[PDB]
């Protein structure tokens, strides 16, 4: 009984890789030596965010790719207007342990999330000229590692409980609970159809969802560590997950399986923080030495290094349109850099 | 520049001048991480927050494997309690101060220790129905190193062993860290009145400890 | 809940002082540049003076730059107008307006009562229509012309439209040509660009009848318009 699904559960699981190899017909780098490389890009600061007071650990751009939230271990939400350097708003905050913050793409709404096992929804466009709490999300177990809009009534939240959960903000009420991963849920990213969304996990493991339906409908194994970040490919059928293991990987939501992996000999440091670009070609990584490197997402050679920070690399977002990268460190510093 | 773009700048340097007030205001407390096991009396010495102020010193005190370690990197001194009546789960303590004094992060992050139960301590050793040699024999030399304690002379030969449960947390505790960071053993009850003194006093002399680095006096 | 209520006010001769005060109840008043606005009997609104939030920049009109003195209270949520040596020319009803500015901000967005007080270089803008009758049901579009390209090189635009219902305050309807206020209909939309601006007012219904003002942003002073009226008939 218990013995005779045990086995069944590994001969399925060898199933699983056996079918995974026989879509290995050949590697990434296997093809791709044919295209131009990138290059060296020379990214450099082109403002400072100065303000912050404490370890930045987390960054969201508007949608208009002109207001950002910033979040600090000072208890404080500040929206920038970057191209003047000007602080739109500042939100005090009830606990002062932020690890994720979210801007809503209509831009009437910010989240914040941390330590308190709470995500706090902001009301920015409101009467009376101040911001003010709309909601106070609550019934998760572990603190929250990320939380995304995915519209003004809807936000998908990771936790350290090893879940993910959807929450309709007018009710106050977990809509769908996400079980499965093993370790703690450190990173996520939705797709831009907004209908499944990636969490890699502490469990060295990511899983592709289904927001609809409620079931993990892939699961990806091919990491050592902590996976810390997590993003999509602007494509949505891919993914790429930074990990403690000091590698990046570009896992693969059809062929179900690693594609391109990132990793030099003189980078021992994990990594914090992965964005990617408009285009895909470029998969920048945050990592803990102080600086973020370019990686060639097909390529997985560094085209370059954005040395600014004096400390860590802790979050790392790009504009939807494509124009600017701000990055955030434990230096109190937002660096937008072109 | 615009009359709407000056207006905002105005209004961007009032919220710069109020950043910074609020900032001020936030240098003179003093973050203190609380930690230990279940069982241990975390508050007898999703996140609760106290605040006690000491001398006119303001201690922020929290409460809460550990991935959100790193959030606690700026943090004065973090509190450890471990279960000294609680024999037969010691071990288990003496591998959570082991992560704790080597974890990448807690690195120049001092540790303040509060060993608890000790009024159980003293009842338990002097009935004799539990050997502590069995848990873990380190006692079977049972020195008595040469020592002086205010308390009392053990009826049981109890104290040595007051001294004894302690070392082993100060063992690994010198062990890494090539003084960069200083655990402080204290012995604690449940009704031990003026406890929150003994944190102020290790906070002042860790602060001492970066001023003198700075100066190099050290 | 937004209420600016004004007192004050009266019968003066010639020569006297009167000082006028506005109590600001239900949102961040410490927040928020605050404005006085006369109102001529037969005339057009007028900028008075200008109080930005913390009391660190204040603009007079040059029409009373002198006898007139601006000030405020935040703790007290009021503001008050010190009026000395009063003229023959000052006999208008004052509003009270707040304006908050930041990326994205609505100023000018509700405007107070008014207080009668009767006793006994800069952009021009017009408003050329007048008056101009209008069948209910149709559609009215309003043309402003300033003498000044009214487009920053931030890509800023600058007129803020009003609507004046009768025995009424003015009202914001659009902040910077293309973006309509809150609680506002659909209907109104602006566009344009600069010294030719235009607004439309599709499906004209009740409760839409007054007289619309053009207002300038770029520089103080605050010159408005000279007003388009639309009647019934």
């Known amino acids: 009984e218990l013995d005779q699904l045990r086995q069944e559960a590994e001969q399925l699981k060898n199933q699983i890789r056996d079918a995974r190899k026989a879509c290995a017909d050949a590697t990434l780098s296997q093809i791709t030596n044919n295209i131009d490389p990138v290059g060296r890009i020379q990214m450099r600061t082109r403002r400072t965010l100065r303000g912050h007071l404490a370890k930045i650990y987390a960054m969201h751009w508007g949608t208009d790719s002109r207001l950002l939230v910033s979040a600090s271990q000072d208890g404080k939400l500040i929206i920038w207007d970057s191209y003047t350097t000007n602080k739109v708003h500042a939100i005090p905050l009830r606990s002062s342990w932020v690890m994720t913050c979210a801007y809503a793409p209509s831009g009437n709404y910010v989240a914040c999330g941390g330590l308190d096992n709470i995500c706090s929804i902001y009301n920015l466009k409101t009467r009376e000229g101040n911001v003010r709490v709309s909601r106070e999300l609550a019934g998760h177990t572990g603190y929250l590692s990320c939380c995304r809009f995915l519209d003004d009534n809807q936000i998908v939240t990771s936790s350290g409980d090893t879940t993910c959960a959807l929450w309709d903000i007018e009710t106050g009420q977990q809509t769908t609970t996400f079980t499965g991963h093993t370790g703690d849920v450190m990173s996520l990213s939705l797709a831009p159809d907004t209908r499944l969304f990636v969490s890699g996990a502490c469990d060295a493991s990511a899983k592709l969802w289904d927001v609809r339906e409620g079931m993990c409908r892939q699961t990806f194994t091919g990491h050592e560590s902590d996976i810390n970040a997590i993003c999509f490919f602007p494509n949505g059928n891919a993914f790429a997950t930074g990990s403690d293991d000091a590698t990046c990987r570009l896992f693969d939501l059809r062929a179900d399986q690693e594609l391109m992996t990132y990793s030099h000999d003189n980078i021992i440091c994990g990594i914090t923080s992965v964005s990617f670009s408009k285009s895909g070609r470029l998969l920048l990584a945050g990592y803990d030495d102080f600086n973020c490197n370019v990686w060639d997402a097909l390529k997985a050679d560094r085209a370059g290094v954005l040395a600014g920070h004096d400390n860590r690399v802790s979050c790392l977002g790009v504009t939807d349109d494509g124009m600017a990268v701000a990055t955030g460190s434990w230096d109190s510093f937002l660096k937008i850099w072109n | 520049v615009s009359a709407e773009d000056k207006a905002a700048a105005e209004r961007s340097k009032m919220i710069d001048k109020n950043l910074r007030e609020d900032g001020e205001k936030a240098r003179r407390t003093l973050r203190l991480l609380l930690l230990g096991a279940d069982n241990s009396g975390k508050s007898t010495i999703g996140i609760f927050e106290t605040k006690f102020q000491v001398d006119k010193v303001n201690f922020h005190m929290f409460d809460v494997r550990r991935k959100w370690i790193q959030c606690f990197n700026d943090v004065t001194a973090i509190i450890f309690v471990v279960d000294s009546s609680d024999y037969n789960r010691l071990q288990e303590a003496l591998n959570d101060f082991k992560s704790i004094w080597n974890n990448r992060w807690l690195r120049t992050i001092s540790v303040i220790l509060f060993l608890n139960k000790q009024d159980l301590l003293a009842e338990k050793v002097l009935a004799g129905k539990s050997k502590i040699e069995d848990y873990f024999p380190e006692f079977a030399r049972y020195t008595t190193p040469e020592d002086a304690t205010p308390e009392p002379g053990e009826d049981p030969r109890v104290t040595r062993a007051k001294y004894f449960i302690r070392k082993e947390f100060v063992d690994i505790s010198t062990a890494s860290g090539d003084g960069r960071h200083i655990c402080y053993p204290h012995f604690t009850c449940a009704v031990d009145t003026e406890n929150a003194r003994r944190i102020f006093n290790d906070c002042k002399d860790i602060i001492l400890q970066m001023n003198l680095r700075e100066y190099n006096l050290v | 809940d937004v209420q600016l209520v004004e007192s004050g006010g009266g019968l003066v001769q010639p020569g006297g002082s009167r000082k006028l005060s506005c109590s600001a109840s239900?949102?961040?008043?410490?927040?928020?540049?605050m404005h006085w606005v006369r109102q001529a009997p037969e005339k057009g609104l007028e900028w008075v003076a200008y109080?930005?939030?913390?009391?660190?920049?204040?603009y007079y009109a040059d029409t009373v730059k002198g006898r007139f003195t601006i000030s405020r209270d935040d703790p007290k949520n009021t503001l008050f107008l010190q009026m000395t040596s009063l003229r023959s020319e000052d006999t208008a009803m004052y509003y009270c307006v707040r304006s908050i500015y930041y990326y994205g901000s609505s100023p000018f967005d509700f405007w107070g009562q008014g207080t009668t007080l009767t006793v006994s270089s800069d952009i021009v803008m017009t408003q050329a229509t007048s008056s101009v009758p209008v069948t209910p049901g149709e559609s009215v579009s309003i043309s402003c012309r300033s003498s000044?390209?009214?487009?920053?090189?931030?890509?800023?635009?600058?007129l803020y439209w009003f609507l004046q219902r009768p025995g009424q305050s003015p009202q914001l309807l659009i902040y910077?040509?293309?973006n309509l206020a809150s609680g506002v209909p659909d209907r109104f939309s602006g566009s344009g660009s600069g010294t030719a601006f235009t607004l439309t007012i599709s499906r004209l219904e009740a409760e839409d009848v007054g007289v619309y003002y053009c207002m300038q942003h770029l520089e103080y002073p605050l010159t408005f318009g000279a007003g388009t009226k639309l009647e019934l008939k």
């Open positions: 239900g949102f961040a008043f410490s927040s928020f540049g």
């Open positions: 910077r040509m293309s």
């Open positions: 000044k390209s009214l487009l920053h090189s931030n890509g800023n635009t600058y």
């Open positions: 109080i930005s939030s913390g009391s660190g920049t204040i």
